[PDB]
Each structure stands twice: as structure tokens, then as C-alpha cells.
């Protein structure tokens, strides 16, 4: 499964980062979602780093040996959401527990 | 591009069953891997079930015994037949279109809660 | 030069060793497909038609010039079914089995050219030999039994322009191919000259074969040729003593059928 | 190099001796699962054709190469029928197949509109339609090239290890079998009463050197009452007379 830091707070004007740690390797493609409370998760990062059209340019991803990372170039109060990562493991779609960012 | 919307019930009792449904504009159900994703009620996301594009189904053993996922290609409607309900299953159930590695879950519904009590 | 079919006398050719069993200084009675003695054999020379295979083929030819190179065996011979192509290409001799398309006029040329077929298809196997008056008589027997294409052959030195030489020799197995296909027709492949063959058919027959001390067939008798041969087969001897022997029964067969009931 | 999936190299084995047990006994494979036949009794069988399907998959996909399995490979790439008879042989090829940065020559089919039939192969890159407008010829919303083309890295878990898989299927198509296991033999001992088996010819008797000669052609000889008189040994081509045991 995917590990999580638990939170980022009062991150304003700075970068923000989330990491998921797995025996799952950065080799597993790691995708990322932004779930504003009350909303369905929104895909923000796919194929490890790429961003979809429609979200801020602020978003991009990266990875280490076994860890996927989400990066926001400038943090805003308006970015508050529960952020998640997902893994296509053996036909089992698993999620991390979510990171609370504001 | 795809307008995917949930349908489902209200309050059901433990041991019961419930047929949930998803459909969307701009999408062939028969051509996609579709998931039902659950958001535990203040607890977090879990994957529950998948139907392969034009194929078989898989379930999270860590989540449930057997509930089934099926589709009707003449309607482009995805269904989840819930059964063996527990109060533990109160949650928001979401529609989802899964592009696996090529593009993760591209399309989501709004989420429908099923209350079990 | 347009030619009609020609015909000849098979004499005692078309005998082959029916098995891989050695016998020494014995007379042996066997039943198999053999060229009947004194049969009417068709003689060919650009005439390379598709001929029936029937139950097996006796093929023989005379040359000095390496013109006869091979054969095509199969059924429809149009790429729709698996077929057997055997060709001497001078460098080597290759036996191929494939769902071959064939030319309606396949040929080779003196090497200056190769044609035979326009195309290959899914192929299953090949067997490849190593790289490398008429004077040479070659005889072959081709029979297809239980999936095996059995080829027998003999090389006889000759010095004759006009016809099949008389004499006796038995053909030995050359190759036994595990192919598994039906053959109903076949065609002879000749080279065109660039910078004379006979075909008979085998029929079920009983023969006595005379084996010498070394296991070589030195003579043979076709038990259905005439009453003397019938006597020899009955007595199991190539020499018959003076006397009367019962050899067969005569039986009158019905010629018509009568069915009658009251009006 | 082994081919990727969506790309199968079918060897077509015919007219030979198959030392099946060498593959089995040499424990160089991680997986050696035979269906319908013991891996060691395979040597006593003979087939008209044997097919070896060569391809590369990830370690967690190895379990999908089976008659009863389902998943991305089992359903869209290499489906075995539920009545499959044959052997699935696989091994860890990380040493040859992983590359730093990813060895991207490996294609998997992430897209198809239906399950693939057993032993069906479909090698088109046709852009796949997920919905709405066909959008044929380009990638775009609801248009996806079917194959992921993942790569393998030196750093991996066992599941992301590439595995080379060879699947051996066997058939008897109303024809002489030509792919046989090896024959076994014993030493040849003369001047004793022995129960013999020469090629397909059997019986009890005593063998001695013979003064007979056979044409290069004959293998067995018989007397006037069709009793085997002598045989040629298959390895040493000498002729040996058979006497009755008293
Ligand atoms: C079989 O192998 C032995 C040992 O190499 C050799 O002496 C013998 O001639 C071989 N026999 C045949 C038929 O190849």
C-alpha cells in the first residue's frame, strides 16, 4: 500500500509536497488526486508526474526509489483538500490514507 | 468531456441488498474499465470493485465477500449489486472511469451515499 | 513439337522389397501393391500433365542429361491443401511440404532458372540433402500408407535410346516420410534446356519373391498373370514338375436380378 | 531476446527428439507447471507438433499464464483455454531484460473491447475507442493507443522483475507423431538368455554373433516360418542370431 505524511498546514506562498512510500516502487505508475471535501477526487497527476489540462500549472510530480511525490509550486488557502495517491497493484486498486493539506 | 452520474438508494438494512447505477454522456461502458470507489464516511478512500473493459471482474477481498459489478452496453449503464450489507458499509459510492496506467481515473461521478442501519 | 501419349510394356519391372525383413535363400509369398507384370505403361516426353496417383505410382525414366528433377504430389494443388514438393535443384535435393500454390505449368531450367510455383504458404517442414542412347535408368515407387509417403528406388545403368530395358531388379526403400496428407494426383517436374519417362500404377497383387542367400530379390512371379504363374504360386516354387495341380476355382456369377410377387 | 506480449514467437517444433526432462530437471526455472501431464512422463509421449510460445511479462503476471486465470494478460494478451494441456515454464530474466531508465521494448495490451480468444493473437496498434465520436487515427479524449510499452528497471520488487515465459502446447493432428521423447537403452550383452527389445521387435532368446549380412536396408531377419532369426543392433550395426533358450 501507499504511506502518507499526515498534513501540511498554513502553507502560503511556498511549495507543498506529499510523499507516498511503498515496496510498490516509483516503478508502479503513481497517480494523484485532489479531493476537496464534499467532492469526488479530482485527478491531478498521472503517469507519475504529468498534469491534466484543467488544473493549475502549479502541479507536477516526481519520484524517488519507492516513493511518489506530489508538488504544488505555490501553496494557497484555496488549495485545501484531502490529497490522495493510488496504485494499480495486481488488479487491486489501492489508495493511500490521504494527506491533509491547507 | 464525459458526464458521469450516480443513482442509488437511501436507507437499507444490514443483510440486505441494493442496486446502484452509473451512466454517462460521451462514454461507452462496454469499452472501459469501470470502478466503484468507496469513501468511507470520514475515514478515507478504498477501491471496491472493477469490471474489465469487455471482460471479467475483480473485488477487494480486504473490503467485502461478494457484491457484484455488471454493465449493460445498450444503456451505457454500470451497476453494482450490493449484498450482504453491514452497517460498516455506510459510505459514499462513486462512479469511476479507469484508464489504469495510461491515465488513472479520468472521470468521476459526484458520489451517492448508501446508509446501512 | 506437339506429341500424343505413347505406350509400353512393363515386363517385370515394378518390384520392390515390401519390408525390411531379411530372408536368405528362400521363396516368399507376399501381398502388396505392385506393378502388374506386363502392364500397359504410359510413355511421356514438354508433356507434364497432372496424372492420377491412384493407389500408388510406378515411375521410371531414362536420361543422360539430368532433366527429370522432381515431382509434385497432392490433391487440389492450388494452395488450398497441404502438398508435397520434391525437387532436385542441382545444389541439393529438397523435399518440402507446404500449402503450396503451384504453377499450371511448373518448370525448372538448365542453374539458369527455377519456377515451379509462384508462392509459398504456411509450410510445415523440409528435408534437405547435402550440397553438390540414355545412360541412366531410374525407377521409383511411390505409395502413401497411413500417412507415410514411402518411396522406393533403384539406379540401373543403361545404354538404350528407345524403350524400357527388360530385366529384373527390386527397388529398395529410399525414404519414408511422416507427412499425414492425402495424395490423389501428381505431376512430373522437368528442366527446360537452357545455357522421356513412364508411368504405371500399382495394384494389389500376390507375388512370390525369390530371395538369394544375401537377401536380394533375384526374381518374382505375378500370381495373377496366367495359369502357369498361378501354379507356381500355389506350389510355392519357380520350378514346376510335370503333373496336374488345382490352382483356383471357377465360379459363375449372376448377371441379372429377378424379383417377383403376385399382381 | 524474447518478444513482448501482443507479440508471440511460435517456434513450431517438429521432426525431433524432445528431451523434456532436461528442462524439468535443470532447476533454472522458477515456474514449471504442467497441465494434464506429469513433467517427467512427457518423455514417454510423442506429438505431431509441439508449439513453444515465447514472450515477456512482469513477475506478478506470471500467475496469469494459466487456463483458469483472468487479468490484463490472461484476457487481452495471452489467453490459455480452460482445457489447456501443456507446460508453462518461466524464469526471472532481470539480468538481461532490466535497463537503467527502463528497458522500453516491452509492450502490454491495456486496451481491447473484448476478451481475446484462447491462442488468438492480435497485433494491431489501432487506436482504441472508449466512447462518443470514433476520433480514429489519433490519440485524444476517448482514443487510446492500446499498448502501455512499460520498461523494466534494475531496481524492482520481485513482481516488477521481467520473466521470460515459454509455453509448450502439444497436439495429435491425425498424423504420424514426429516430436518424441528420447528412447532409453541398456547395454547389449551376448550369450545369455535375455528378454529383448530392439526397436519395435521383442521376445526372449539368446544372442550371438552372426555370419549373416543384410543389405544396408534390412533390419531384422526371419526363418522360413516367420520367426525372427536375427536382428541388427541399432547402435552397432552388427547382426546377431537368436537362439531359443532351452
Ligand atoms: C553411436 O555412438 C557411438 C559412440 O560415439 C559410436 O561409436 C557409434 O558408431 C554410433 N552409432 C551410430 C549408428 O551412429
Author numbering:
A (entry chain L): 3 to 9, 11 to 105
B (entry chain H): 1 to 82, 82A, 82B, 82C, 83 to 100, 100A, 100B, 101 to 112
C (entry chain B): 22 to 66, 79 to 143, 154 to 175, 185 to 247, 264 to 331
D (entry chain A): 346 to 591
Quote the study's own text.
S728-1157 demonstrated broad cross-neutralization of all dominant variants, including D614G, Beta, Delta, Kappa, Mu, and Omicron (BA.1/BA.2/BA.2.75/BA.4/BA.5/BL.1/XBB). S728-1157 binds the receptor binding site (RBS) that is fully exposed when the RBD on the spike is in the up conformation.
Using symmetry expansion, focused classification, and refinement methods, we achieved local resolution at the RBD-Fv interface to approximately 4 Å. Our structures confirm that S728-1157 bound the RBS-A (or class 1) epitope in the RBD-up conformation, similar to other IGHV3-53/3-66 antibodies. The 32NY33 motif and 53SGGS56 motif in S728-1157 CDR-H1 and -H2 interact with the RBD in almost the same way as CC12.3. The diglycine VH 100GG101 in S728-1157 CDR-H3 may also facilitate more extensive binding compared with VH Y100 in CC12.3, likely due to the flexibility in the glycine residues that lead to a different conformation of the tip of the CDR-H3 loop and a relative shift of residues at 98DY99. From our spike WT-6P-Mut7 + Fab S728-1157 model, Y505 to VL Q31, and E484 to VH Y99 are predicted to make hydrogen bonds, which have the potential to be disrupted by Omicron mutations Y505H and E484A. However, a Y505H mutation would still allow for a hydrogen bond with VL Q31, and an E484A mutation would add another hydrophobic side chain near hydrophobic residues VL Y99, F456, and Y489. Although many mutations have been observed in the RBS-A/class 1 antigenic site, with regard to the S728-1157 epitope, 13 of 15 total RBD contact residues and 2 of 3 CDR-H3-bound RBD contact residues are conserved within Omicron and all other VOCs.
